[PDB]
Symmetry: C2
Subunit: 173 residues, 2 copies
């Protein structure tokens, strides 16, 4: 029933399942493309979608489903427009409660970036480059505004930055 | 007559006029909004539009027309989606002739950013912040790939970065 027009409550219930169930539910869902086809979205819905995609694409068992989900993710307005706009919108957030919760979503975004640079390195260069170019600015803005960042998050961002830099360098020629 | 449905040839002819004529033609054109409502565009058309906006919004005579043109520009998909993607696409350009022409369009983009941060500082913080966060990466990529950058361009980008940083700082509280 709701396995097509994936709603907020449906994804909330689906997140509790194990990564295999989540990735197989998303890969066989018709509305996944329509789920990520929004350039504008609420913060809560975007964070839930990022959590669900982080958990699903981490499935070290269902390669074809992760492939399908990441292939839909890389060509979606969610990754191209919505996520960069949200990362930029982190800088002008006055409320401290949301600024303190931002690091978890940043970690989820960096994990999805690693997934993209490992599964679709050649065709997802532009989107991952835009996101890894926008992330350090919001990280410095949150670090200066009291919000602490986990060191592992910085390590992962530097790793994905190195991979993306090498892919851009090898595409320049 | 043909001043609506702003086409490539119309903007090519209009660019030769003085800044007052250009800005008044754009402000009184119905299709201006529909001209900038494209998230995807050709390189030549985007560069022509950026040149036209640089020349028009430089008009130190017609304040109302510059206000209208910049107000349409700040809320358009051209500035939100098209220009950041175009700036990111500079890094993976193999052709050297286009990489060598990029600095002029970068200077035009920085000039439009100065226009936005001086005319609409409060409401255009997000869009100008995304572009001033994406520009130094493509500048480093072009500087490493042999393409030289003008010193005045770097000065202007650092100035607009300082203004945007202070606006974000004053929006955090």
């Amino acid at each position: 029933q709701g396995a097509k027009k994936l709603g907020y409550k449906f994804l909330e219930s689906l997140l509790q399942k194990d990564p295999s169930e989540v990735v197989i539910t998303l890969a066989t869902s018709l509305g996944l493309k329509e789920l990520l086809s929004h350039s504008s979205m609420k913060s809560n819905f975007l964070e839930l979608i990022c959590q669900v995609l982080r958990k699903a694409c981490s499935s070290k068992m269902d390669r074809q489903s992760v492939l399908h989900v990441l292939g839909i993710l890389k060509n979606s307005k969610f990754l191209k427009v919505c996520l960069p706009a949200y990362v930029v919108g982190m800088i002008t957030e006055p409320i401290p409660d949301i600024r303190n919760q931002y690091p978890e979503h940043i970690s989820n975004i960096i994990s999805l970036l690693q997934d993209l640079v490992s599964v679709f390195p050649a065709s997802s260069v532009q989107e991952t480059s835009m996101l890894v170019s926008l992330l350090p600015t919001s990280l410095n803005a949150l670090r200066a505004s009291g919000v602490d960042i986990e060191e592992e998050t910085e390590k992962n961002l530097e790793k994905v930055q190195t991979i993306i830099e090498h892919l851009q360098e090898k595409r320049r020629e």
